[PDB]
């Protein structure tokens, strides 16, 4: 039946059963693909064949993609068609207002899609005095000032050099006013420094103010994660519940997702719930908070705890956009067995499971040929 709660149901099967089949792509093709970018890992000395065996048993290539912004295409693609995805793509996204209430309001009791795009914001915090022969703009830390003799300078999160509008002497007031050589490369709102107290510290409180004008109207938020939500239609009010769908950048897929069944575990929270979470994301500002709501949210299944502490502690602000369409089940649906039917003519098994492992046994004879085509008797 074209319900969108069966829709939830089949995507769901599906992704957490054959993985990257999914994608649709041909055994051979992905071993030949493999093999073209893996060539020049096989070692050049030796039995070439126990060499290109080695690299094929190595290789990660039925592993489906961690890219998060990749799944949400993959989900957008199944589920709106590719027609439906590209009009989907080109509407706007909406921050997400501070309870919430904005994407609450926008979920009717219809089969609803929603894309979610977090964003990070950058400011910078430090700043370094430094000679132009020493300035590599492509090697240095980005986000950053660098106050050079005749120049002030924002390096910003791409790594463009921006030119912050000073003067070359007001440069050199500053550039030789900062002589303490732990005031060389260090912090640019400092609460202690007192201008009164020394030309160093007036130098380094008017740099702070020169930076602090300049970013006033700067907005850069930068994206950092990608999701999408499916929320089915339901026959009461209290029933409806939200799925959310990732996989996270070099951390998981939307198959391990699913496997761990964190789309269940937070949709246990409800709608209200959810969403409540979401916003507090964006109006926290301790990082603490932030850190243990971003894994709670994001992690691979089982790591809340340890997802978001340490080196990835969330120490910057945050923000939420959104963008909802509505899905109809049975082009969802159609997509969807129009997967099943490419995996079930090409690779057939009893279950699941073992036309996976037929998937990959076809996978790895066809890098196997493809490197030994390149390799074996040159």
């Not at 592993?63 to 693609?77: I, R, Y």
């Not at 209430?101 to 009791?109: D, I, T, V």
């Not at 719930?273 to 850190?291: F, M, N, V």
């Amino acid at each position: 039946e074209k319900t969108g709660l069966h829709v939830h149901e089949k995507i769901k099967h599906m992704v957490k059963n054959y993985g990257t089949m999914i994608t649709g792509i041909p055994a051979e093709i992905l071993g030949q693909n493999e093999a073209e970018i893996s060539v020049g890992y096989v070692k050049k000395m030796g039995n070439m064949k126990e060499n290109i065996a080695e690299v094929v048993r190595k290789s990660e290539m039925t592993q489906p993609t961690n890219s998060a912004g990749k799944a949400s295409n993959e989900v957008c693609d199944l589920l709106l068609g590719t027609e439906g995805a590209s009009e989907f793509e080109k509407s706007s996204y909406q921050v997400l207002s501070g309870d919430g209430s904005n994407l609450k309001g926008s979920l009717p009791n219809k089969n609803l899609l929603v894309r979610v795009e977090m964003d990070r914001f950058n400011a910078p915090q430090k700043y370094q005095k430094i000679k132009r022969e020493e300035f590599n703009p492509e090697t240095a830390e980005k986000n950053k000032i660098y106050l050079l003799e005749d120049q002030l300078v924002y390096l910003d999160i791409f790594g463009k050099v921006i030119d912050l509008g000073q003067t070359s002497d007001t440069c050199h007031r500053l550039f030789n006013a900062i002589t303490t050589p732990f005031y060389q490369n260090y912090i640019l709102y400092d609460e202690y420094i007192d201008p009164e107290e020394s030309a160093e510290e007036a130098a380094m409180f008017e740099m702070g103010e020169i930076v602090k004008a300049k970013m006033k109207n700067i907005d850069c938020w930068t994206a950092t994660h990608s999701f999408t939500i499916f929320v089915p239609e339901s026959d009461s009010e209290d029933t409806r519940t939200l799925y959310p769908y990732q996989a996270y950048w070099t951390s998981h897929t939307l198959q391990q997702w699913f496997s761990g069944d964190k789309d269940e575990k937070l949709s246990r929270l409800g709608i209200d719930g959810y969403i409540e979470k979401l916003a507090l994301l964006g109006t926290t500002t301790d990082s603490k908070i932030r850190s243990s709501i971003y894994g709670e949210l994001f992690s691979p299944p089982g790591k809340e705890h340890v997802f978001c502490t340490g080196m990835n502690e969330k120490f910057s602000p945050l923000r939420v956009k959104f963008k909802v369409t509505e899905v109809n089940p049975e082009i969802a649906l159609q997509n969807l067995e129009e997967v099943q039917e490419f995996i079930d003519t090409n690779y057939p098994g009893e279950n699941a499971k073992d036309q996976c492992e037929l998937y990959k046994i076809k996978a790895q004879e066809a890098m196997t040929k493809q490197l030994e085509m390149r390799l074996l008797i040159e």
